[model samples]
Target: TAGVVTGKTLPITKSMIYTDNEILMPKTTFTFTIEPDTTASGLEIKSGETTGLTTKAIVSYDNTDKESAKNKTSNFNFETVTFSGIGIYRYTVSEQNDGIEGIQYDGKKWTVDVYVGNGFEPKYVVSKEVNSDVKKPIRFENSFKTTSLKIEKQVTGKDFNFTLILEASALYEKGQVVKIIQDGQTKDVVIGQEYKFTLHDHQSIMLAKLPIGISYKLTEDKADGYTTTATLKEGEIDAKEYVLGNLQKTDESADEIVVTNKRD
Candidate 1:
C-alpha cells in the first residue's frame, strides 16, 4: 500500500466593506480590493464551490433574501465587485481543497465601509443659530465662510481630520466669532494639517473652521487658487435642526418685555 502524502494550503486573507449609508441612495460603483496571501503552491482551486476553493461574495439587508452572488471564482489575480442598494450588507470568501480530504487550508476575511449620496449629504452640523439675543451672539461668533472646503468620509470611531487648501485665506481673531455650543459649551477645534477630533460611535459633524472674512467656494481643482468662483458650492448640514428656544435664557422676575421668539 502506498503511504498518503499531505499537502499544505496557504492561508487566503480577505477584507471588504459591508455597511454604508449610501447603500441604495444611488447606483454608485464600489470597488472591493481583494488581496490573497497564497504562499503555498500545488493546490488546485475548485470552481463552482461556493464554500470551497471558490470565493463567494453576496450582499443583503436581510440574511434570508440574499442578493445574487457578486463573485464566485478564484481564478482572477484580484477580485473587485460592486453593489447597489441602501442598508447593511454582508460578504464572505472561503478556500477549498481540490485534492483528497485531510489537506490543510487557511484563509482570512475583512470588512469595509461604503457610502453613496444622491446629492449632498451632511454628516453633522458644526454650528447653528436662531433669532435670540442670548444665543445669537454666541452662535454668530463661530460662523465664517472659507474660500475652499472639502468633505471626505471617514471610518467610525477613528479620529476626524482634514486639510484646508487655502490660497488667499483670512484668519479670524478668536472671540470675533460666535462661541460654539454643543451639548453645553464650545469645543476647541484646531486648524492646519493632521487636526484630531475623536468621533463618538457613528457620529458625523461638519468642520466649522474657516479663514475669517473670505467667502470662498469649493472647487474640484486646487490649482486655480481661491480667487475663482466657478466651482464654488455651498457647505453641507448633517444634523437635525436644533431649536433655539431649547437653549434660551429668560428673566421672568422683572417687568414683562416683548421678545421675539425663534426656532432653529
Candidate 2:
C-alpha cells in the first residue's frame, strides 16, 4: 500500500509605524524557524522545507513615500513542507530575534498539525495554547525615532513682534500636523507650505516631534527701522539684509534658529 505525499506553505505578516517621508526606514530582515515537535504526538515522517525562512525590509517598503509604506505589506512565504507517510506531523513556528535596535519581534509560538489519513487527500490545522484563541496569524509591528526643532527671538530694546516663516521640502505635499510650543503653551499647526509664526522678544518656540531628514528654511519678515541678525548651526549671519536660505535636519539632535532685531 503506497501512501500519498503532500506539501504546504504558510504566510507571515510585518507592520511598521512612524511618520512618513521624514526618516529612512530601518534596514531589517525577518526570519522564521520551523521545528518538529515530537513531544506533542509527532510522526516519523520528515519535512523537506527549509528550517530557516527570511523576508527583507528593502523590497517590502518605500523609503521616499510614507503612504506607500503604510499601504504596502510584506509577507513571509514559507517553502512547501513535503510530507511523506505521516500519521500526525506536529511543528512549532516562531520568529528569530536579529537584535536590531528599535524593532520588537513577535514572541508567540504557534502549533501546526498535519493529519494524514488512508486516502490521497490530507488535512491540516493551526492552533495556540489559549482555549479562546482563534487561528492565530503571525504578525510583527515596529516603530522608529523622531526629532524636533527650536526657534528663538532676541531684541536689544522693548518687546517686539517678529514674523517667522518656515518652508519645508517637497516631501510634504499635503502637509503634516506638528506641535508648536511657546512659553508653556502648545499649538498644532499643519506645516507643508510657507507656514508663519508670531514670536515676541526673548521668547522661543519649539517644533516638536518632527521626522528626520527634513530640509527646511526659516526666515524672518523685514521690519521697519530695525537691523536683523540670524544665527544657525554654522555660526551667525551678521546683519542679514536679504531672505534666509535652506537648512537640513539630519539626525536625532535638535536644531535651533535664532533671530535678533535691533531698534535703529
For lDDT, the strongest prediction is 2
Estimated TM-score for each candidate: 0.17, 0.51
Q: Judge candidate 2 at residue 136 and give its lDDT.
A: 56
Cα lDDT of model 1 by residue, 60-164, tens digit: 121111123221221221112222332212222233322311112233233211121222221111111222112110000001122212233222112222222
For each candidate in the order shown, give its overall lDDT on alpha carbons: 0.22, 0.53
> What's the alpha carbon RMSD for model 1?
26.8
Candidate 2 Cα misplacement greater than 4 A, ranges: 1-9, 15-74, 77-138, 157-173, 182-185, 233-243
Which ranges of candidate 1 are over 4 A from the true structure?
1-185, 190-194, 207-264
The Cα error of candidate 2 at residue 148, in Å, is 1.6
Deviation (Å) of 189 in candidate 2? 2.4
**Residue-wise lDDT of candidate 2 within 94-167, one digit each (tens)?**
66776654345666666555454442224544434323345555455555565677777787754445443333
